[PDB]
């Protein structure tokens, strides 16, 4: 899923840069430098959060195993409650009649 997010991030970055380059000659150049460094801050934040993602990409498989563990233990808890539930449905419904 990170490939799709990487492509979409690169696309939105290139498109916003295209809009910035289109307004670059249009904008007043002195304040346009300020708008350029604001856009550079935008791109730096996008890229550093992608850097955090590709850092965590080593730690992805352990979280996959943790999700497997959590699903398994939730299943066994539902087994305990289902056993108690079926015993209650025995003791209060079928034996009374």
């Amino acid at each position: 899923r990170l490939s799709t997010l990487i492509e979409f991030l690169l696309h939105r970055a290139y498109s916003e840069l295209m809009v910035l380059t289109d307004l670059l000659p249009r904008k007043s150049d002195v304040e346009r430098k300020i708008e350029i460094v604001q856009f550079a801050s935008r791109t730096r934040q996008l890229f550093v959060r992608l850097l955090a993602l590709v850092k965590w990409a080593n730690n992805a498989g352990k979280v996959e195993k943790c999700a497997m563990i959590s699903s398994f233990l939730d299943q066994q808890a539902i087994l305990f409650v289902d056993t108690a539930d079926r015993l209650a449905s025995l003791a209060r419904d079928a034996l009374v009649h």
């Binding site: 997010l5 979409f8 670059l24 249009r26 150049d29 430098k33 934040q45 955090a52």
Partner: protein
């Protein structure tokens, strides 16, 4: 071990306030990971008009 290692030691090399949250950043561009943007147009090559627009002072 301490797991409050800053968003630094993690993202340490990049300059600027990497630790600062998206709400504090107040950037429309940053709001992108939460909802994917559409690929309306393919990446285009650099043009002379861009350089003419910049060129500093």
């Amino acid at each position: 071990k301490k797991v409050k290692e800053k968003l630094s030691n993690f993202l340490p090399d990049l300059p600027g306030m990497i630790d600062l949250p998206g709400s504090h950043d107040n950037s429309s561009l940053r709001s992108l990971i939460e909802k994917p943007p559409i690929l309306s147009s393919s990446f285009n090559p650099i043009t002379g008009t861009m350089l003419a627009g910049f060129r500093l002072h």
